[PDB]
Amino acid sequence: EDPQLLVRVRGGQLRGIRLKAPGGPVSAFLGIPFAEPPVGSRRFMPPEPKRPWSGVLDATTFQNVCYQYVDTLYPGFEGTEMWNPNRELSEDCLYLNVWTPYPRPASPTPVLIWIYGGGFYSGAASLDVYDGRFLAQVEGAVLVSMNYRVGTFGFLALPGSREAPGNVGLLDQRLALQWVQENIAAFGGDPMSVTLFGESAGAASVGMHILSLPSRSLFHRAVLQSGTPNGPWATVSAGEARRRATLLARLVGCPPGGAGGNDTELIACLRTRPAQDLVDHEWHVLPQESIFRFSFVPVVDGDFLSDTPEALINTGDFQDLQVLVGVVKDEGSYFLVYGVPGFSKDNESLISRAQFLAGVRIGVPQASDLAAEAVVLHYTDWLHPEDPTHLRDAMSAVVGDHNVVCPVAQLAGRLAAQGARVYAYIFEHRASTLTWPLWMGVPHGYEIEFIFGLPLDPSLNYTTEERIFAQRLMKYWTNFARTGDPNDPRDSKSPQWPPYTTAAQQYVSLNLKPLEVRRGLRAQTCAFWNRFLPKLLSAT
Ligand SMILES: *[P@@](=O)(OCc1ccccc1O)Oc1ccccc1C
Ligand SMILES: *[C@@H]1O[C@H](CO)[C@@H](O)[C@H](O)[C@H]1NC(C)=O
Ligand SMILES: [Cl-]
Ligand SMILES: [Cl-]
Ligand SMILES: [Cl-]
């Protein structure tokens, strides 16, 4: 028996596995159950704490990926498939993972918790890109990532009912946070210093846990990468959620005869449905022709979220809090191949002006005609309005700015304004190994493999530049995680990464070159998106 691989948590004993990271061994305890399986009658309902077990639980392998839609756009192509599920599908899927150094660390170690993204529809904590082994080996960290429920299973809501209350995926995440608070000490982690970091939907989730008190009590620092709790895609009014669930039920023959009024007898019917029925039907309820919008997301129930996120970020008090926010250089591009006609991974995707206008209607789905007109006006180069290259890059920009960049702006501005200590970044490095075409720049999601330090694995064919860069990012993130500052304490030569402030508005470029400080995060464009646009498409 290996003393370092046997742990006894509150539920009982579990056995881990000694892994080879490049630079040495690490400890991995994978597939630890944190909730009773939300299957059958527990469908759509909040997680229940995992009932204690006997004997030593085998924690040496990844557990099931939560039942979910699978991406089929470009089959065989690494660039999409990397995000696809890599273990079996199952509603029995609420397991988590811990990486630590080997031997398990002597002193309480600052814990990193990873919340994955993927539309609140796709997702798994077991994907190669979210592999904690490098951070554990190299920076000495204790890294935790959980599975949470995505899709209808995680987010179908009849707001106010008992049987489908909404935001149960977030509650899964929270339960995982509680497990960490209650048990991470056993692995050498330190419950007194917990950082959540996430991406896309993940970041939105992190945002939500900032904004919802009982989660807020369970950690100390956040990192939001390319996503926010505010913004157009991360939430839904209870009205819309109710609409969407009702409609989904209708689509899977679940009125059954024509009803939907008795919620209990509706959710009941739904629970009698095969999981792939629900998947194969989930996207159908989206109200408009759109990209960067999924059917089932966090809902504004006045419970988990006491008000809209935007309200909360406006009126909160965040003195107690340090956040690291940032975006990649080309947020929008990835999404264009998923709906905006004229865009493909297979060519330069040069577009006509017509395709551009139609594309704006698709990308800013909830725009009024006048809103769309303002968008087109702002984004056109009126000197060369016909130029396909400018147009293409513009469409990428519209989608990026609208969905990611300017919400990150807004959120950093408010949090800074509201007491928090914020640090901001722009990730500008195209991975040498990127399989997506050149026109897509540094797409949404492609900084993760660096933060997790995958280029430290020589078999993975990054450049030495990229190995070094990876180590730099890892140092940044763990420094933050450890001490609410990404800077190197034992140094002055970086140069320093300054806090984002409403006054100075400073962020840094993370690329191969040394830190460079820039002021104004898409300032003017974001004034357009965040100050005017709402005055416009409302009061229309
Ligand atoms: P995000 O969750 O983006 C996906 C998404 C978000 C909102 C609506 C629809 C949709 O598809 O996560 C990623 C995007 C692209 C690549 C990788 C991830 C994790
Ligand atoms: C909903 O309506 C049905 C009758 O169609 C009834 O049997 C059931 O008790 C009702 N549920 C609740 C919780 O009132
Ligand atoms: Cl019950
Ligand atoms: Cl025109
Ligand atoms: Cl470009």
Tab-separated table of N, CA and C in Angstrom, residues 28-119:
chain	number	residue	atom	x	y	z
A	28	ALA	N	-2.301	11.321	-8.597
A	28	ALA	CA	-3.608	11.610	-9.183
A	28	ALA	C	-4.677	10.761	-8.535
A	29	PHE	N	-5.709	11.412	-8.026
A	29	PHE	CA	-6.842	10.724	-7.442
A	29	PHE	C	-7.983	11.141	-8.319
A	30	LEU	N	-8.343	10.261	-9.257
A	30	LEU	CA	-9.347	10.578	-10.277
A	30	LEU	C	-10.680	9.850	-10.075
A	31	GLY	N	-11.788	10.551	-10.328
A	31	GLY	CA	-13.093	9.910	-10.320
A	31	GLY	C	-13.647	9.700	-8.919
A	32	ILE	N	-13.485	10.712	-8.072
A	32	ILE	CA	-13.965	10.662	-6.699
A	32	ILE	C	-15.405	11.156	-6.680
A	33	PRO	N	-16.324	10.368	-6.108
A	33	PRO	CA	-17.739	10.760	-6.193
A	33	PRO	C	-18.060	11.830	-5.165
A	34	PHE	N	-18.694	12.921	-5.576
A	34	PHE	CA	-19.006	13.983	-4.623
A	34	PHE	C	-20.494	14.149	-4.412
A	35	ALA	N	-21.269	13.409	-5.173
A	35	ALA	CA	-22.700	13.475	-5.025
A	35	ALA	C	-23.259	12.114	-5.330
A	36	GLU	N	-24.463	11.846	-4.830
A	36	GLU	CA	-25.234	10.690	-5.265
A	36	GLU	C	-25.617	10.950	-6.706
A	37	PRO	N	-25.472	9.933	-7.557
A	37	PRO	CA	-25.808	10.012	-8.981
A	37	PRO	C	-27.228	10.539	-9.238
A	38	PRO	N	-27.308	11.677	-9.931
A	38	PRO	CA	-28.577	12.347	-10.196
A	38	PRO	C	-29.299	11.635	-11.302
A	39	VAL	N	-29.555	10.342	-11.141
A	39	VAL	CA	-30.239	9.579	-12.175
A	39	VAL	C	-31.677	9.256	-11.797
A	40	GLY	N	-32.471	8.882	-12.797
A	40	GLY	CA	-33.863	8.553	-12.568
A	40	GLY	C	-34.628	9.720	-11.978
A	41	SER	N	-35.137	9.550	-10.760
A	41	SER	CA	-36.022	10.545	-10.158
A	41	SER	C	-35.243	11.750	-9.622
A	42	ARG	N	-33.925	11.672	-9.707
A	42	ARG	CA	-33.108	12.777	-9.257
A	42	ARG	C	-32.747	13.653	-10.443
A	43	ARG	N	-33.387	13.381	-11.577
A	43	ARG	CA	-33.121	14.130	-12.798
A	43	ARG	C	-33.683	15.541	-12.673
A	44	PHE	N	-32.882	16.521	-13.099
A	44	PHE	CA	-33.214	17.955	-13.045
A	44	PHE	C	-33.181	18.533	-11.632
A	45	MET	N	-32.807	17.716	-10.647
A	45	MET	CA	-32.886	18.123	-9.240
A	45	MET	C	-31.505	18.358	-8.656
A	46	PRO	N	-31.419	19.209	-7.624
A	46	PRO	CA	-30.115	19.523	-7.063
A	46	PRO	C	-29.396	18.260	-6.609
A	47	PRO	N	-28.052	18.300	-6.569
A	47	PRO	CA	-27.260	17.145	-6.161
A	47	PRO	C	-27.467	16.869	-4.684
A	48	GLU	N	-27.404	15.589	-4.319
A	48	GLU	CA	-27.345	15.166	-2.927
A	48	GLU	C	-25.920	14.705	-2.652
A	49	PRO	N	-25.357	15.115	-1.510
A	49	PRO	CA	-24.079	14.655	-0.967
A	49	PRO	C	-23.880	13.148	-1.104
A	50	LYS	N	-22.685	12.716	-1.483
A	50	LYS	CA	-22.417	11.301	-1.686
A	50	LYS	C	-22.471	10.535	-0.376
A	51	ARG	N	-23.392	9.574	-0.294
A	51	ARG	CA	-23.515	8.719	0.886
A	51	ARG	C	-22.234	7.914	1.029
A	52	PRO	N	-21.657	7.907	2.245
A	52	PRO	CA	-20.424	7.213	2.636
A	52	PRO	C	-20.339	5.790	2.122
A	53	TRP	N	-19.123	5.359	1.819
A	53	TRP	CA	-18.890	4.030	1.290
A	53	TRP	C	-17.936	3.293	2.189
A	54	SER	N	-17.829	1.993	1.964
A	54	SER	CA	-16.909	1.161	2.718
A	54	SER	C	-15.880	0.605	1.769
A	55	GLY	N	-14.787	0.105	2.323
A	55	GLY	CA	-13.701	-0.389	1.499
A	55	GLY	C	-12.973	0.762	0.849
A	56	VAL	N	-11.901	0.471	0.121
A	56	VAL	CA	-11.162	1.544	-0.530
A	56	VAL	C	-11.670	1.773	-1.951
A	57	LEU	N	-12.160	2.975	-2.219
A	57	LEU	CA	-12.689	3.307	-3.536
A	57	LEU	C	-11.563	3.476	-4.555
A	58	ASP	N	-11.722	2.853	-5.715
A	58	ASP	CA	-10.696	2.937	-6.749
A	58	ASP	C	-10.705	4.291	-7.476
A	59	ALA	N	-9.713	5.118	-7.180
A	59	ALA	CA	-9.668	6.459	-7.747
A	59	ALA	C	-8.453	6.676	-8.657
A	60	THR	N	-8.326	5.820	-9.666
A	60	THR	CA	-7.123	5.769	-10.490
A	60	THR	C	-7.380	6.102	-11.950
A	61	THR	N	-8.656	6.298	-12.272
A	61	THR	CA	-9.114	6.489	-13.640
A	61	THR	C	-10.154	7.592	-13.667
A	62	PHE	N	-10.359	8.187	-14.834
A	62	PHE	CA	-11.361	9.227	-14.994
A	62	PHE	C	-12.736	8.602	-14.991
A	63	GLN	N	-13.719	9.340	-14.490
A	63	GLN	CA	-15.083	8.844	-14.443
A	63	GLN	C	-15.873	9.246	-15.690
A	64	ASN	N	-17.140	8.857	-15.780
A	64	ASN	CA	-17.930	9.217	-16.957
A	64	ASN	C	-18.063	10.724	-17.177
A	65	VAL	N	-18.047	11.116	-18.453
A	65	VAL	CA	-18.460	12.440	-18.921
A	65	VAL	C	-20.000	12.567	-18.868
A	66	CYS	N	-20.480	13.726	-18.418
A	66	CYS	CA	-21.908	13.962	-18.234
A	66	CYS	C	-22.604	13.971	-19.571
A	67	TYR	N	-23.813	13.410	-19.599
A	67	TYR	CA	-24.530	13.184	-20.840
A	67	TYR	C	-24.708	14.509	-21.522
A	68	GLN	N	-24.456	14.546	-22.827
A	68	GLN	CA	-24.282	15.821	-23.518
A	68	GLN	C	-24.270	15.670	-25.038
A	69	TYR	N	-24.585	16.763	-25.732
A	69	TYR	CA	-24.469	16.843	-27.189
A	69	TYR	C	-23.022	16.652	-27.643
A	70	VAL	N	-22.829	15.912	-28.732
A	70	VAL	CA	-21.490	15.746	-29.286
A	70	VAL	C	-21.283	16.419	-30.650
A	71	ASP	N	-20.187	17.176	-30.734
A	71	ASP	CA	-19.845	17.994	-31.892
A	71	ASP	C	-19.423	17.225	-33.162
A	72	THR	N	-20.082	17.546	-34.265
A	72	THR	CA	-19.996	16.757	-35.490
A	72	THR	C	-19.686	17.619	-36.717
A	73	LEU	N	-19.482	18.912	-36.484
A	73	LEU	CA	-19.183	19.873	-37.532
A	73	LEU	C	-18.061	19.415	-38.467
A	74	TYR	N	-16.865	19.281	-37.907
A	74	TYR	CA	-15.715	18.832	-38.664
A	74	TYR	C	-15.193	17.538	-38.054
A	75	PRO	N	-15.822	16.400	-38.387
A	75	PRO	CA	-15.452	15.095	-37.817
A	75	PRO	C	-14.071	14.570	-38.250
A	76	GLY	N	-13.302	14.084	-37.282
A	76	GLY	CA	-11.946	13.638	-37.542
A	76	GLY	C	-10.945	14.738	-37.242
A	77	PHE	N	-11.418	15.974	-37.336
A	77	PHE	CA	-10.587	17.159	-37.191
A	77	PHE	C	-10.292	17.443	-35.723
A	78	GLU	N	-9.007	17.488	-35.383
A	78	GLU	CA	-8.577	17.647	-34.002
A	78	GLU	C	-9.190	18.879	-33.365
A	79	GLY	N	-9.203	19.978	-34.113
A	79	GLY	CA	-9.651	21.270	-33.614
A	79	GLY	C	-11.045	21.325	-33.009
A	80	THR	N	-11.944	20.452	-33.451
A	80	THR	CA	-13.228	20.320	-32.771
A	80	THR	C	-13.198	19.154	-31.774
A	81	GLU	N	-12.606	18.043	-32.184
A	81	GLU	CA	-12.710	16.821	-31.402
A	81	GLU	C	-12.037	16.883	-30.041
A	82	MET	N	-11.057	17.774	-29.894
A	82	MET	CA	-10.344	17.927	-28.628
A	82	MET	C	-11.313	18.243	-27.486
A	83	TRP	N	-12.360	18.996	-27.808
A	83	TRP	CA	-13.383	19.387	-26.848
A	83	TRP	C	-14.445	18.303	-26.628
A	84	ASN	N	-14.533	17.345	-27.545
A	84	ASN	CA	-15.499	16.251	-27.411
A	84	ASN	C	-15.245	15.298	-26.233
A	85	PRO	N	-16.300	14.588	-25.773
A	85	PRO	CA	-16.186	13.697	-24.612
A	85	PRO	C	-15.182	12.593	-24.865
A	86	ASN	N	-14.371	12.268	-23.868
A	86	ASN	CA	-13.340	11.268	-24.061
A	86	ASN	C	-13.509	10.062	-23.154
A	87	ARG	N	-14.577	10.063	-22.360
A	87	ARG	CA	-15.052	8.836	-21.716
A	87	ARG	C	-16.547	8.607	-22.013
A	88	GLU	N	-17.137	7.541	-21.485
A	88	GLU	CA	-18.536	7.246	-21.804
A	88	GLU	C	-19.547	8.274	-21.263
A	89	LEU	N	-20.693	8.379	-21.943
A	89	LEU	CA	-21.789	9.228	-21.473
A	89	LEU	C	-22.675	8.511	-20.467
A	90	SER	N	-23.172	9.272	-19.501
A	90	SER	CA	-23.954	8.758	-18.381
A	90	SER	C	-24.468	9.913	-17.534
A	91	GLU	N	-25.680	9.766	-17.005
A	91	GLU	CA	-26.224	10.753	-16.086
A	91	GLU	C	-25.586	10.530	-14.729
A	92	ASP	N	-24.945	9.377	-14.563
A	92	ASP	CA	-24.111	9.133	-13.386
A	92	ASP	C	-22.736	9.705	-13.676
A	93	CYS	N	-22.513	10.950	-13.297
A	93	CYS	CA	-21.370	11.610	-13.849
A	93	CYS	C	-20.725	12.616	-12.915
A	94	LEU	N	-21.309	12.789	-11.729
A	94	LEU	CA	-20.808	13.740	-10.744
A	94	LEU	C	-19.691	13.115	-9.965
A	95	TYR	N	-18.515	13.172	-10.584
A	95	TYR	CA	-17.255	12.776	-9.981
A	95	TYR	C	-16.293	13.940	-10.130
A	96	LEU	N	-15.239	13.960	-9.315
A	96	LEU	CA	-14.176	14.968	-9.423
A	96	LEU	C	-12.790	14.346	-9.338
A	97	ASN	N	-11.786	15.186	-9.596
A	97	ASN	CA	-10.385	14.777	-9.642
A	97	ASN	C	-9.464	15.723	-8.907
A	98	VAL	N	-8.437	15.144	-8.295
A	98	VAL	CA	-7.392	15.914	-7.631
A	98	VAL	C	-6.006	15.471	-8.089
A	99	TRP	N	-5.208	16.413	-8.561
A	99	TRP	CA	-3.786	16.165	-8.753
A	99	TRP	C	-3.038	16.841	-7.618
A	100	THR	N	-2.038	16.165	-7.058
A	100	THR	CA	-1.110	16.786	-6.099
A	100	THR	C	0.337	16.385	-6.417
A	101	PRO	N	1.328	17.005	-5.755
A	101	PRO	CA	2.682	16.510	-6.042
A	101	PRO	C	2.894	15.164	-5.400
A	102	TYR	N	3.944	14.458	-5.809
A	102	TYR	CA	4.325	13.186	-5.206
A	102	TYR	C	5.745	13.261	-4.588
A	103	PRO	N	5.869	12.970	-3.293
A	103	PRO	CA	4.827	12.605	-2.335
A	103	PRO	C	3.863	13.749	-2.114
A	104	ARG	N	2.631	13.403	-1.772
A	104	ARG	CA	1.645	14.350	-1.299
A	104	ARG	C	2.344	15.417	-0.426
A	105	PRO	N	2.056	16.716	-0.674
A	105	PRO	CA	2.820	17.851	-0.103
A	105	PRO	C	2.732	18.008	1.424
A	106	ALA	N	3.828	18.440	2.037
A	106	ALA	CA	3.934	18.471	3.497
A	106	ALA	C	3.140	19.603	4.125
A	107	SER	N	3.212	20.777	3.509
A	107	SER	CA	2.529	21.960	4.010
A	107	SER	C	1.316	22.269	3.163
A	108	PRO	N	0.254	22.773	3.802
A	108	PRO	CA	-1.000	23.232	3.192
A	108	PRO	C	-0.750	23.976	1.886
A	109	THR	N	-1.291	23.470	0.789
A	109	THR	CA	-0.925	23.978	-0.522
A	109	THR	C	-2.093	24.705	-1.172
A	110	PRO	N	-1.851	25.916	-1.697
A	110	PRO	CA	-2.940	26.671	-2.313
A	110	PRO	C	-3.588	25.869	-3.418
A	111	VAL	N	-4.914	25.755	-3.319
A	111	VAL	CA	-5.714	24.884	-4.173
A	111	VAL	C	-6.237	25.652	-5.372
A	112	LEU	N	-6.101	25.059	-6.548
A	112	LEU	CA	-6.713	25.575	-7.755
A	112	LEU	C	-7.945	24.731	-8.135
A	113	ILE	N	-9.100	25.356	-8.331
A	113	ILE	CA	-10.255	24.574	-8.776
A	113	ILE	C	-10.641	24.979	-10.183
A	114	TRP	N	-10.825	23.990	-11.049
A	114	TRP	CA	-11.049	24.260	-12.453
A	114	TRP	C	-12.461	23.940	-12.839
A	115	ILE	N	-13.144	24.937	-13.384
A	115	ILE	CA	-14.464	24.736	-13.928
A	115	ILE	C	-14.372	24.856	-15.426
A	116	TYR	N	-14.741	23.784	-16.134
A	116	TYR	CA	-14.655	23.757	-17.587
A	116	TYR	C	-15.780	24.528	-18.236
A	117	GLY	N	-15.681	24.780	-19.541
A	117	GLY	CA	-16.729	25.464	-20.285
A	117	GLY	C	-17.344	24.611	-21.392
A	118	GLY	N	-17.888	25.252	-22.409
A	118	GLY	CA	-18.545	24.497	-23.451
A	118	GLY	C	-20.059	24.669	-23.444
A	119	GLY	N	-20.494	25.926	-23.415
A	119	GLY	CA	-21.865	26.314	-23.680
A	119	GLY	C	-22.901	25.977	-22.641
